[PDB]
C-alpha cells in the first residue's frame, strides 16, 4: 500500500498487508418482479451500477415500477426478485514491514457475491485485483476516487497471528507418515527432533 502509486492505475496488482476493518454484508437488488391483479400478469426490470463491468458504459438510471402501462397497481413479489451480496474491506501495511515511527498507508477493496466473507479483522492477506479510478474528480463543478475491485483474496499465516497454517498432503507424504508409525520408537525419534 505504500509503493502503490498513480502510475499503476488500470492494471492488475498484488497487495500485501493486514485487514483492519470489514463492513456488514448487505443484499443488492438486480431484478425485481411484480404482479397486476387487474390483468393477471407479471412484470420485471433490471438494475446495474458502475462497479460490475470493467469498461465504462453510458449510464441507464431506470426507476422502480409501481404502476402498469395502463395504470394498474402492482404488488411487489419479494420472493421472486434476485438479490446478490456486497461487502467492503480496508487493507493496511503489515507492522513488521512498515517503517518505524511513521504513519501507515491503506487501500479499499470491494468484494461481491462469493468472495464476501473470507476474512476477519486482524489478518495477514494478499489481494489481487484492478486498481480503478471512479467518477469525476470535481471537474463537473482532493482528486479521483481510487479502489481495488477484488478478484482474488488469499489468507496468509504469520508468527503470532490468528490465521492457522495448513498444508496439502500428498499421497507420497501419507505413505511416509503411515510407514513411520509401525516402528516402535516413534516417540523417541519425534522427541529428539524437537529443537
Amino acid at each position: 500500500p505504500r509503493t502503490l502509486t498513480a502510475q499503476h492505475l488500470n492494471k492488475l496488482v498484488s497487495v500485501e498487508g493486514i485487514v483492519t476493518k470489514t463492513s456488514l454484508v448487505r443484499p443488492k437488488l438486480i431484478r425485481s418482479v411484480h404482479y397486476a391483479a387487474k390483468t393477471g400478469r407479471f412484470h420485471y426490470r433490471d438494475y446495474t451500477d458502475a462497479t460490475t463491468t470493467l469498461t465504462t458504459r453510458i449510464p441507464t438510471p431506470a426507476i422502480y415500477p409501481t404502476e402498469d402501462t395502463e395504470g394498474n397497481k402492482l404488488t411487489t413479489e419479494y420472493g421472486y426478485s434476485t438479490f446478490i451480496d456486497h461487502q467492503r474491506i480496508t487493507v493496511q501495511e503489515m507492522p513488521e514491514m512498515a517503517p518505524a515511527g511513521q504513519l501507515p498507508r491503506s487501500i479499499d477493496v470491494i468484494l461481491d457475491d462469493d468472495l464476501v466473507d473470507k476474512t476477519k479483522p486482524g489478518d495477514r492477506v494478499n489481494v489481487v485485483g484492478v486498481f480503478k479510478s471512479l467518477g469525476a474528480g470535481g471537474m463537473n463543478q482532493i482528486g479521483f476516487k481510487t479502489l481495488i475491485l477484488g478478484n482474488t483474496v488469499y489468507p496468509l499465516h504469520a508468527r503470532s497471528t490468528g490465521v492457522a497454517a495448513r498444508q496439502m498432503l500428498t499421497d507420497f507424504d501419507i505413505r511416509n507418515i503411515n510407514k513411520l508409525s509401525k516402528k516402535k520408537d516413534i516417540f523417541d525419534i519425534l522427541s529428539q527432533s524437537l529443537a
Binding site: 448487505r26 443488492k28 451500477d49 413479489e77 420472493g79 421472486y80 466473507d117
Partner: protein, 604 residues
Amino acid sequence: VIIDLDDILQYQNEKFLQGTQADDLVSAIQQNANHFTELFCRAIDNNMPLPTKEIDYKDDVLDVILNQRRLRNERMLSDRTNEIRSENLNDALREVVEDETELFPPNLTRRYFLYFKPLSQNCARRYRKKAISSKPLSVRQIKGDFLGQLITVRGIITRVSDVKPAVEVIAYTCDQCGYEVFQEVNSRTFTPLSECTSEECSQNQTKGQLFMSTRASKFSAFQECKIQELSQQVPVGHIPRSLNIHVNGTLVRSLSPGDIVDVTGIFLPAPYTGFKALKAGLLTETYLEAQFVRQHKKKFASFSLTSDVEERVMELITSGDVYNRLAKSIAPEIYGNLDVKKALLLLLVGGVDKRVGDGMKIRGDINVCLMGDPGVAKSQLLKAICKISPRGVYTTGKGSSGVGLTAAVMKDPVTDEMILEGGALVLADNGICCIDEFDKMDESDRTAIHEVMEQQTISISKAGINTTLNARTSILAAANPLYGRYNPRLSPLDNINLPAALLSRFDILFLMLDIPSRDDDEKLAEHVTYVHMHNKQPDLDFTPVEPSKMREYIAYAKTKRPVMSEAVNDYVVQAYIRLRQDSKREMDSKFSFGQATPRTLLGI
C-alpha cells in the same frame, strides 16, 4: 387467528387418497409468504358466520365503531336501490348500485389478526416431505437467497423495546361535505394531508379543511427485538453476530431479555441506512417479521393444569420416593454430594412469602453457599443449576463488575427514550443467580448482594439516577478457603475471606473439604473414568428425570401454600431453645462459623 400449515398438509394429502386433484399450496405459502396473508384475510371475510350477542354496554370501544360502520354500509345500498327504483329508468341492479356508491373497505371493518405457524418436522417426516420452515438457522446462514421466505431462527434475546402505537391508516374528517378520508402509511416518515380529496369537495370550488380524528385511525402494537448467536454456533475464532425482529398484533410482550427461543418469521428488506459515500447500487437492510414464538424452557407462571400435565405428574407420583429421585436427578455425572443436592432442590422449589400486615413482607426463597478445596466440582454444580432453572444466570467474580450487576443508563434507538438496562441481578428476577469465585469480588459488588439477600431491592444514588430496582432473586455462591486448602490448625473464620455477617444471611452453608480416604477414592475414580468412557451415568437401577418433567413437577409444587398448626409450632420452639443453648459454648471456644440467630429459625 393462527394458521397451521400442518392442517394444509393433511387437507392436500386427503385430496390425494380420494383421488381428486389439488395444488402445492404449502411451498407457495413458504416461498412467497407476504401475499397469502391478504389472500387468506379476504377469503375469510367472504366466509363469516353471524354474531349472536347483541352489542351491550360491556363491549370494547373498538367494537362499537366496527359494528356501527357495517350498519352505515348496508343503509346506503338500500337507500340507493330505493332511489334507483324511483325513476324507473334484479341482477344488473346490484352491479349498478355497487359502482354508484362509496363504502368502507374491508380493512376498516375487520377485527382479527392472522399469523402462520411453521410446518412441524414430525408431520413432514410422516407424509415424506422436507420442512424448510421448522429447520432452525443461525444468524450467519441467512443470506440474500432467503428474502421473502418463511424461516425459523435460533438465538438469544439481547434487547426488547416497549410497546408503542404504529399508524397504518390515518383518518380525517371534513366539515364542508361530511365524508371521511383514509390515508395509508407504510414508511417510517409520512406527510399529512391538508385539503379535502372527497368527490363533493373535489368538484365544488370551495374545498374544506382536514382534521385528524385519533379514535378512527388504524393502529398496531409494535415491538423490536435483537437476537444474537448461541456460543455453540459461532465458528472458531470469530465473534457472534446479530439480527432484528419485528412483532405486531397480539404477539407483543411475549419475548423477554435473556431467553433462548425459536422464532418463525418472514424475511423482508428495508431501505438502506448507511453512509452515502459507501453506497454502490441498490443496497438494502433485512428484518424479520414474527409469526410464532417457541421457548426452550417454559416459565412457571404460565402453568395451567391440563390433562397431559395430569398424566405425567400422576405417573411421577405413583412411583413414590420423589424427594430422593429428584435430588439424584441433578447432575447425575457428579459423584456423591447427596445432601448438597437435597438442599439444591429445595432452593429450586422455595418457600412461602408473607404479607404480615401493614404491607410488610418476609421473603420465602432460600440462599445457599458452597465452600471447599480445589477440584470438588462446585462450578459444575453452578452450571447445572443455571441450566435447569427457567431464569438463571452464571457469572464469575471480576468479569461482571459495576454496571454489569445493577443497571445502566442508555438511550433507546427505537423509541428515543431514556431506559435502564438490566444487569445479571435484574435478568434473574424470579430465578436463580449463580456467582463463582465469591471471595474475589469488589466491596461495592458485595454491598449489592448484601442488600438483595436482605430485602430484595437495589438502591442507587449516582449522577442521573435515584431509583430502587425490584430484584426477587435467589443466590447460589461458591468460594475457596483463603489459603487454598483448609487449615484445621486455624480457626474456621480464619480460613474464609468473607465477613461473618454475610455468612449469617445464607440459609445453609456447606463446607466441602478434601480429606484423602483410600476407600472412597476408588469409588470416585470409577465414576469419573466410567463417564469418560461412556457418555452416560453408571447406575442401571435408577431413572434420571428429564429436565422438562422436573420443571413441571416444580411448577405444580409451587402452586401450593401449606400452613402451620400449633402442634408443629411446639416442636419448632423446643428445637430452637436447645440450638440457642448449644451454639454459645461452641462460639466461645472459636470453633463455629456462627452463633445461632432468629434467621436460623426463619430458615428452618
